[PDB]
Swiss-Prot record, chain A:
Described function: Salivary chemokine-binding protein which binds to host chemokines CCL1, CCL3, CCL4, CCL8, CCL17, CCL18 and CCL22.
Residues of the full protein shown: 31 to 114 of 118
Species this chain originates from: Amblyomma cajennense (Cayenne tick)
Broad class of the protein's primary localization: secreted
UniProt entry tagged with the keyword Aminoacyl-tRNA synthetase: no
The name this protein goes by in its record: Evasin P974
One example GO MF annotation: C-C chemokine binding
Residues annotated as glycosylated: N15
A GO CC annotation given for this chain: extracellular region
Subcellular localization, as worded in the UniProt entry: Secreted
UniProtKB/Swiss-Prot annotation, chain B:
One GO CC annotation: extracellular region
Protein name (record): C-C motif chemokine 7
Effect in UniProt of substituting K16A: Decreases binding to Link domain of TNFAIP6
Role played: Chemotactic factor that attracts monocytes and eosinophils, but not neutrophils. Augments monocyte anti-tumor activity. Also induces the release of gelatinase B. This protein can bind heparin. Binds to CCR1, CCR2 and CCR3.
Compartment(s) of residence: Secreted
Subunit structure and binding partners: Monomer. Interacts with TNFAIP6 (via Link domain).
Organism field: Homo sapiens
Length: 84, 67
């Protein structure tokens, strides 16, 4: 059954504004590549690090911009944290 | 469960038989419904779509609510 390749929930982190930003700009979804739109704010954190990070602890997270499915570093940071 | 957000919604109704449960999902840039299938796939769906609302009601009615 074809659920599509862009319909999977995508990891996020939350900042001081309680507005979530996506982690990276791609992941595997239903056998395909699920990409965010170009320019979308993203955290330059790989999935394996995000999987392990201490939940609900403030980190200083590197900010980036999506370009062809990759979170390109913008050399800016903000506090963010992973939910329960 | 508050660690992911839906980016895009499924375009077509999911067959009712494949569904096991759902959760919701401001915080995220879009309010969303996430259906979980019996093969444990999680599928983002548009809460503004009538079929999404009907399916949530159906899954609510399938189990008795505890206590």
């Amino acid at each position: 059954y074809d659920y599509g390749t862009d319909t999977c929930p995508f990891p996020v982190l939350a900042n001081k504004t309680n507005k979530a930003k996506f982690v990276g700009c791609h992941q595997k979804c239903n056998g395909g590549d699920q990409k965010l739109t170009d320019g979308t704010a993203c955290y330059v954190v790989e999935r394996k690090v995000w999987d392990r990070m201490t939940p609900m602890l403030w980190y200083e997270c590197p900010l980036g911009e999506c370009k062809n499915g990759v979170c390109e570093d913008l050399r800016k940071k903000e506090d963010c944290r992973k939910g329960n | 469960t508050s660690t992911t957000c839906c980016y895009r919604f499924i375009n077509k109704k999911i067959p009712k038989q494949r569904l096991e449960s759902y959760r919701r999902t401001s915080h995220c840039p879009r309010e969303a419904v996430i259906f979980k299938t019996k093969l444990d796939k999680e599928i983002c769906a548009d809460p503004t779509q009538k079929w999404v609302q009907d399916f949530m009601k159906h899954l609510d009615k399938k189990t008795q609510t505890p206590k």
